[PDB]
Amino acid sequence: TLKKADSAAKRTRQAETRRLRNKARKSEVKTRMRKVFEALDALKKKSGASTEELVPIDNLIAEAYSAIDKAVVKGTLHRNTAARRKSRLARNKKVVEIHHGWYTPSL
């Protein structure tokens, strides 16, 4: 058997496999981000003191960043997007804590 279509076939298959890889890498981000957000709602609604509850939260946060940048350098994401995702997590983490009350920059 001699098969001749290089470009067509080969690029097709490559596209599939790479697509599965990419799909994984994005799903990861959506997921861990989602856990962070559930944690943040759970915290904003009820009353804890953040000095205590930020520990599980920041473990989840650090995990999230890890997933993000791993997806940047593996190359499924473009860095500038990553920047936005992280910025979002940071913003939510900043929103809840003003509601409960420890920090408030004003100038």
Q: How far apart are CA 79 and CA 10, in angstroms?
A: 29
Q: How far apart are CA 90 and CA 17, in angstroms?
A: 33
Q: How far apart are CA 45 and CA 38, in angstroms?
A: 11
Q: Is 12 in the site for RNA (CB under 7 A)?
A: yes
24: tokens are: 């994984």
Q: Is 91 in the site for RNA (CB under 7 A)?
A: yes
Q: Is 3 in the site for RNA (CB under 7 A)?
A: yes
Q: Is 101 in the site for RNA (CB under 7 A)?
A: no
Rounded alpha-carbon distances, angstroms, from residue 107 to 90, 99, 104: 21, 19, 10
Q: Is 34 in the site for RNA (CB under 7 A)?
A: no
Q: Quick one: which of 17, 47, 51, 106 contacts RNA (CB under 7 A)?
A: 17
User: Which of these, 84, 87, 32, lies nearest to 61 by C-alpha position?
Assistant: 32
Q: Is 9 in the site for RNA (CB under 7 A)?
A: yes
- Which 38-67 residues touch RNA, going by CB under 7 A? 58, 61-62, 65-66
Smallest gap from residue 47 Cβ to RNA (A): 19
For residue 37, the one-letter residue type is: F
Binding footprint of RNA on the chain (CB under 7 A): 1-15, 17-19, 21-23, 25, 58, 61-62, 65-66, 68-70, 72-76, 78-95, 103, 105
